[PDB]
Amino acid sequence: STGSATTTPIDSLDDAYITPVQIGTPAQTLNLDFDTGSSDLWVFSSETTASEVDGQTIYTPSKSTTAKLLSGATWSISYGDGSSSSGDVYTDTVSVGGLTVTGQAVESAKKVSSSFTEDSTIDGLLGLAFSTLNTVSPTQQKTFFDNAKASLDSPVFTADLGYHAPGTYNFGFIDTTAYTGSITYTAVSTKQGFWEWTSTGYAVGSGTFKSTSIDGIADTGTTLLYLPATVVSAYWAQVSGAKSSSSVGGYVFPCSATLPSFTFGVGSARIVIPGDYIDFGPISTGSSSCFGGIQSSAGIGINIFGDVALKAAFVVFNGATTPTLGFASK
């Protein structure tokens, strides 16, 4: 089997991407944030504290003839940005882009943190990291991809995120028309439960490529590119007037600037992030200070190849017995 679904930016900055997901019978379609940095499929629901729901579409398990309470199971998750959610668990039929999994754990939120409530466009998350990170207790549950894998034509999914435009998540096949050149594959460590890999270096604009190993994770659920402070300083040094602002929370730059590109290495291959992808707009409405899309990972404890990096590539998440990642230009 295969599936293919369009993923759409939630706003004009590509802060996140939402993909429609069919849950239950009859289908209830919710728009979920596909997150290769986590492993829970959780949704706003009829059980979510009413004051914490503000415009999201909810899953109502009592209206699904295939929903079953997973007795005794609870979940609770905290994300790298400080947000969190928790609740109980149902199993139900879940379909993405025509690919159906029966008996998928659907984690129904009883509580969500304020950042989720305040984002009316995201109805929940669909985790695509390794199932070892799933938070359901006392019986850990499998991700949608883990459940689908054996049925897929090939045990892979691909992320093709758009810049200021929709893109595609495919399951079970590699669309050879969706990228240019060849896909370069690189080794993955699953020891932390992430799609963790090692970039071979970077360049700023038209500058020389610096060969250096940068361990990090491919994370579709993180907006920005978080790299070591040395790398980030080298980038922003090429933007007149850019500086790190402790009060804003990262590097800012004059909105009048033209940003240089940023290149990262995948083996001997190179992925070029155009400068425009690194502009996250005014820090507050009407400001002439703009927020940068490349930020330091110091204090996060891991480097993160988030959407800024991934949307410059066609990315293969190869879930074979020994997983690997592939990157192609597009």
CA distance 109 to 77: 10
Q: Are 96 and 171 in contact (CB under 8 A)?
A: yes
Q: Which two tokens stand for residue 119?
A: 């984002």
Q: Which residue has the tokens 């988030």?
A: 306
**Residue in 38, 45, 108, 199 annotated catalytic:** 199
**Residue in 14, 33, 35, 40 annotated catalytic:** 35
CA distance 231 to 269: 19
Buried b (16+ CB within 10 A) or exposed e, 212-233: eebebbbbbbbbbbbbbeebbe
Q: Method of determination?
A: X-ray
CA distance 96 to 196: 25
User: What's the half-sphere exposure (Cβ side, CA atoms, 13 Å) at 184?
Assistant: 18
Q: How many domains does the chain have?
A: 2
Q: Which two tokens stand for residue 2?
A: 């295969």
Own/partner pairs, 239-244, CB within 8 angstroms, 24+ separation: 242/292, 244/296
Last residue of a domain, one of 150, 174, 198: 174
Q: How far, CA to CA in Å, does 299 sit from each of 69, 130, 232, 237?
A: 39, 23, 14, 21
Last residue of a domain, one of 146, 174, 202: 174
Instruction: Give φ, ψ of 123 to 5 degrees.
Output: -95, 0
- CA 37, 40, 41 angle in degrees (round to 5)? 115
Last residue of a domain, one of 115, 147, 174: 174
Give the resolution in Å. Answer: 1.0
Please report, for the domain that includes residue 254, its CATH number. Answer: 2.40.70.10
Domain that holds residue 102: 5-174
The answer on 12 and 155 residing in a single domain is yes
- CA 73, 78, 83 angle in degrees (round to 5)? 125
Q: Which helix (H) or strand (E) holds 235?
A: helix 229-236
Is position 247 annotated as part of the catalytic site?
A: no
One-letter amino acid at 69 equals L
Show Cβ contacts of residue 38 under 8 Å, excluding neighbours closer than 6 positions. Answer: 77, 79, 125, 127, 129, 133, 221
User: Considering only CA atoms, which of 265, 264, 282, 281 is closest in space to residue 273?
Assistant: 264
β-strands 68-78, 279-282 pairing: unpaired
Is position 35 annotated as part of the catalytic site?
A: yes
